[PDB]
Amino acid sequence: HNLHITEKLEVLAKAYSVQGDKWRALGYAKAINALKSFHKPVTSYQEACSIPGIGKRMAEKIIEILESGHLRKLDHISESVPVLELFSNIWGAGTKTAQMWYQQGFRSLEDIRSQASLTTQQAIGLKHYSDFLERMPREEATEIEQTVQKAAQAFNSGLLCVACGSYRRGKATCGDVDVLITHPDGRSHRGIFSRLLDSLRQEGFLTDDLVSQEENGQQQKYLGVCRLPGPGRRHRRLDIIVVPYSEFACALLYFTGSAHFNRSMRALAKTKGMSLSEHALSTAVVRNTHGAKVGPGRVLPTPTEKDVFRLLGLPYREPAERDW
DNA sequence: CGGCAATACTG
DNA sequence: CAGTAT
DNA sequence: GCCG
Ligand SMILES: Cc1cn([C@H]2CC[C@@H](COP(=O)(O)OP(=O)(O)OP(=O)(O)O)O2)c(=O)[nH]c1=O
Ligand SMILES: [Mg+2]
Ligand code: NA
Ligand code: NA
Numbered sequence: 001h002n003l004h005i006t007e008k009l010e011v012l013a014k015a016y017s018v019q020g021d022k023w024r025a026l027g028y029a030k031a032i033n034a035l036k037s038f039h040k041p042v043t044s045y046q047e048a049c050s051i052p053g054i055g056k057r058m059a060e061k062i063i064e065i066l067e068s069g070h071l072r073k074l075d076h077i078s079e080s081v082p083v084l085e086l087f088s089n090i091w092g093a094g095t096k097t098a099q100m101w102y103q104q105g106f107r108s109l110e111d112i113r114s115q116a117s118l119t120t121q122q123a124i125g126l127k128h129y130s131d132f133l134e135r136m137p138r139e140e141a142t143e144i145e146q147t148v149q150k151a152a153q154a155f156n157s158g159l160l161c162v163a164c165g166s167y168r169r170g171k172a173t174c175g176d177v178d179v180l181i182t183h184p185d186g187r188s189h190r191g192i193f194s195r196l197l198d199s200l201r202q203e204g205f206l207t208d209d210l211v212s213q214e215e216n217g218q219q220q221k222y223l224g225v226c227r228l229p230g231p232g233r234r235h236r237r238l239d240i241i242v243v244p245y246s247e248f249a250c251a252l253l254y255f256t257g258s259a260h261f262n263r264s265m266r267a268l269a270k271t272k273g274m275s276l277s278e279h280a281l282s283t284a285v286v287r288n289t290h291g292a293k294v295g296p297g298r299v300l301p302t303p304t305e306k307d308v309f310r311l312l313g314l315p316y317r318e319p320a321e322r323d324w
Numbered sequence: 325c326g327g328c329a330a331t332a333c334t335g
Numbered sequence: 336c337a338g339t340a341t
Numbered sequence: 342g343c344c345g
Binding site: 012013016021023024025026027028029030031052053054055057058 | 342344
């Protein structure tokens with residue numbers, strides 16, 4: 001909700017991110033993800049330090065954007081950054097691949113297309129490069145969720161289908177469509193991916209598969225590309241997860257996010273000797289001196305999302321209140 | 325000093 | 336496993 | 342980067 005001083009920081013955060021300095025980029029993310037949820041412009045160095053997420057190092061940079069109106073750090077960002085960002089926006093390519101391609105002399109998508117060795121996923125990502133950078137209106141996301149739900153309830157009307165992610169958080173636009181599928185009887189959700197996916201392929205709704213371990217009967221997620229019928233339609237990313245009714249609440253909480261919200265909640269659980277994943281909320285978890293899990297602990301009953309919050313000693317938050 | 329979420333595929 | 340993804 |  002404020003301080004365009006962040007637009008200068010966002011640039012650095014993205015630079016460190018594409019370059020692989022993930023932890024540093026996370027630090028900037030939180031500092032920025034904070035300078036927004038805040039209220040008044042920061043006018044003092046000590047007034048910065050006071051904000052949770054901002055430190056002495058960050059404050060000194062927040063003073064050069066006000067006292068000087070410009071951050072000199074941006075003037076020394078590697079010329080490789082724009083290219084690394086270009087490359088890492090290819091679905092399936094991350095910082096490691098982008099850096100490798102850059103080191104190999106590649107500088108444009110034309111270079112990637114004609115000379116780079118692409119994985120199957122990356123070839124799909126490049127083929128839909130522009131489309132994958134666009135967000136769809138939530139109205140279209142509804143159409144996509146309904147298309148999957150109809151095909152699902154087609155072979156089992158008992159299947160519960162819910163659109164999660166940014167859609168459930170009530171955003172105006174959606175990057176992809178995240179559909180969670182389960183079954184109230186807690187058993188019939190058995191290997192339905194085969195039937196659902198082949199049904200969606202049957203009607204030409206699915207165009208490309210990115211992640212889909214279909215040889216496996218334990219498949220949990222399907223990440224792919226779909227496109228609604230008619231003219232003026234673009235390819236949209238689709239992410240579907242089938243979960244046992246037993247893990248419905250945690251799966252719903254997870255898939256709804258946001259990402260930063262999930263990380264915050266999971267971090268809280270850890271401080272309480274507990275653990276949260278899309279599968280369950282556990283207590284009495286044993287972790288070594290490195291926060292690594294050594295002992296599983298006990299799964300706690302979590303029939304509903306509110307239960308998870310309750311068990312964590314947190315007040316319930318509607319999906320729209322989790323848009324962190 | 326050293327964690328910063330916890331998990332699922334791919335090859 | 337590393338890399339990438341949610 | 343931040344912070345316990
Ligand atoms: C990326 C990521 C995501 N999640 C969860 C929580 C969100 C859902 C859906 O992710 P998505 O990227 O579609 O996000 P979404 O919120 O739907 O935003 P878009 O509208 O799709 O961009 O997955 C997570 O726990 N950790 C992560 O690192
Ligand atoms: Mg989404
Ligand atoms: Na990418
Ligand atoms: Na497959």
